[PDB]
Amino acid sequence: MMDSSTFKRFTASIENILDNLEDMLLLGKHQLNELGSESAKIKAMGIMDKLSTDKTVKVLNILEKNIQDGSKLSERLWRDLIMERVTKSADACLTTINIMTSPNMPKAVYIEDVIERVIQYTKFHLQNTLYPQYDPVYRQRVIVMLYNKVCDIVSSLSELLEIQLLTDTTILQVSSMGITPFFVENVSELQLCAIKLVTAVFSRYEKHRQLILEEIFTSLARLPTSKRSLRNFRLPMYIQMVTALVLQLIQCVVHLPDVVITNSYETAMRTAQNFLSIFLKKCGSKQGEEDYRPLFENFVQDLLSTVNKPEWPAAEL
């Protein structure tokens, strides 16, 4: 459809009545929930031919909304608490959908302050809430739906970061979260989304290879080491998650445009050999109070377990 202006005017009416009643301080749950629900696909082609400064003022308004629970630091007040986080999580969903919506996205219809704000919202509220009660070591459907919103928002965050360059003062902490959940238990689909994020940040920028490998080697001891659900990646033949993470780092860097192919490919083997050399030298000696050996054995059986499948190469390398 070239226009399909049959609910484009429906949504456009929604934002113009909203900014009329607010601009001339909260907009409530249900309206913004249905706004995100329709924003899933209706504007995914129809966002074009819309008034730019209205987009700026609405993202400023929802920015000021997400300011309130940005680092919120939080029997009956808990209902207010849960509805506050669900409201701002839906607001986060509207932000991360609204920015990515067009296949071609005009410059400065966004400011990095709101993306920073949704990032820090994600940081604090995720580490405060979802890890402790899905992993007792760090220690009703509202948690589940919040979880699903987290998954969707981080997936959209990944594809949005692949779309356009961001500043390093965003890159450091988005890589931090992209690696963070890989040492708790019931987060597998979050780990797939984190794989998507690290594809975006890793293939997009060549300057953080050292960074990523150092935070990889830092907290390896936090691995669950449990017989239950250790291998949960279908290819029977389920495999462990961080092995496939390593594999997709290996195959992720190509930088496809002459000799660029050759130098980038030898750069790939060099990055891999630095990774495995540092990992091996950390593993080999017996350190105090712990070991990195069992990591190395389970890692390598998974490596040769995925030795020959046409969509997992370089295990031979």
Binding site: K107, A108, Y110, I111, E112, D113, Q164, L165, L166, T167
Partner: peptide
């Protein structure tokens, strides 16, 4: 401008 991917702030 598009491949720059520049980051705009409030003081634009």
């Amino acid at each position: 401008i598009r491949e720059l991917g520049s980051l705009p702030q409030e003081a634009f």
